[PDB]
């Protein structure tokens, strides 16, 4: 067992260009016909991670893969699971209980309906007008695909992915060389 | 223990040439590829003895080596030690503290920007730009080379090696035999 890698933004190399998101929801719905071209979606837009204003600047947030994660604990039936490197949610077990969104701290996890094929995902028996099936949507860290599209699409290359491991060594490095040079 | 030699100029053959700082320079900074040659020397110029011009003619003034030195006393950190026959300061350990600009009456001590390997030397963290190392320069009689360079470069021959020692037993034989000659 290894440290998760994830995600984090920067303040003073953001503007909230919103470029990330959109990459974001191209490339994790690729099964929804897409090809990088504006005008084939055919489908509303769902990003992973959220943009966020205050007046200390603009901000984008994502999951930040806890071990030892509350919404893999609270989830009864089991949807959550740390299937790869990065906790991710699997799409078929989820029952729209909305126990995650008192779980997580952050509130990196949504309740969105699902589209699958270019249409909206329907239920069996539910009400007279037909209710679409909800699911959570949270950032996978792209296990499937390839490299993050959340970064490499930041015009000012704010959104970093950090192994926790690099930086502890780094800054205990850096400690030692600015105390050592004094005495 | 005996007492320490120091350079000694004489006003009465000293025009203001200003060769003998250059040869100071140019004998020190060997490890900032100097080749006895204008052109190669990439870094501004330090002397250690110092020309001063007033109406009564000129003269160079620099460390006289005292063995009580006010300044290796005011100095906390500890930079200036009589590790050999002279007094030396160490260019590792001092920090600027400019207590010794008020101890050495004469002012044989300068604080000026360090050198080394034809480059200058950065701090760790300082102001949004970067600030040189300022470390003090004095003579050192040249005790990690050989003889002194600011002799057997003036071309008046007016500086002087002068031994505390061997010059008052001269003066006293002199004395004497200008007194017992008479009587
Ligand atoms: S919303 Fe889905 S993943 Fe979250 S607790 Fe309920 S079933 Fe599990
Ligand atoms: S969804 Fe929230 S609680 Fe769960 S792993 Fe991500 S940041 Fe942690
Ligand atoms: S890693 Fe993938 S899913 Fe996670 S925020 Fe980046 S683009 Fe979205
Ligand atoms: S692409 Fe970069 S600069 Fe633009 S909103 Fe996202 S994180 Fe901020
Ligand atoms: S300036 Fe340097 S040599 Fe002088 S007292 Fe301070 S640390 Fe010592
Ligand atoms: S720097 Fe001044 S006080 Fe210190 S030994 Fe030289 S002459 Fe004396
Ligand atoms: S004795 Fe040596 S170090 Fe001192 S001023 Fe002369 S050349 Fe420079
Ligand atoms: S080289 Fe001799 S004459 Fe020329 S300035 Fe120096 S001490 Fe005076």
Same mark, same amino acid.
């Given at each position: @067992? ?8 920067? &303040?003073?190399? %953001?503007?909230? /260009? =919103?470029?990330?998101?959109?990459? %974001?929801? #191209? ?30 600047? @603009?901000?984008? $947030? ?7 994660? &509350?919404?893999?604990?609270?989830? @009864? ?9 990065? $906790?991710?949610?699997?799409? !078929? ?6 126990? /995650?969104?008192? #779980?997580? &701290?952050?509130? #990196? $996890? +949504? *309740? *969105? ?10 239920? $069996? ?15 996978? *860290? ?9 970064? =490499?699409? %930041?015009?000012?290359? #704010? ?6 491991? +690099?930086? =502890? !060594?780094?800054?205990? =490095? ?5 105390? *050592?040079?004094?005495?």
């Amino acid at each position: @067992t290894q440290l998760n890698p994830f995600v984090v933004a920067n &303040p003073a190399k %953001c503007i909230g /260009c =919103k470029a990330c998101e959109v990459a %974001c929801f #191209a490339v994790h719905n690729r099964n929804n016909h897409v090809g990088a071209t504006v005008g084939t979606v055919s489908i509303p837009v769902i990003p992973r991670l959220h943009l966020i204003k205050t007046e200390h600047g @603009t901000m984008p $947030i994502q999951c930040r893969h806890c071990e030892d994660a &509350p919404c893999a604990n609270v989830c @009864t039936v089991g949807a959550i699971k740390r299937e790869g490197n990065a $906790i991710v949610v699997d799409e !078929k077990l989820c029952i729209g209980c909305k126990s /995650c969104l008192l #779980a997580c &701290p952050f509130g #990196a $996890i +949504e *309740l *969105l309906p699902q589209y699958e094929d270019g249409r909206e995902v329907f239920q $069996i028996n539910l009400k007279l007008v037909q209710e679409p099936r909800i699911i959570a949507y949270k950032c996978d *860290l792209c296990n499937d695909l390839g490299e993050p599209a959340c970064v =490499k699409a %930041c015009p000012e290359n #704010a959104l970093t992915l950090v192994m926790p491991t +690099e930086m =502890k !060594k780094a800054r205990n =490095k850096e400690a030692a060389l600015s105390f *050592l040079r004094v005495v």
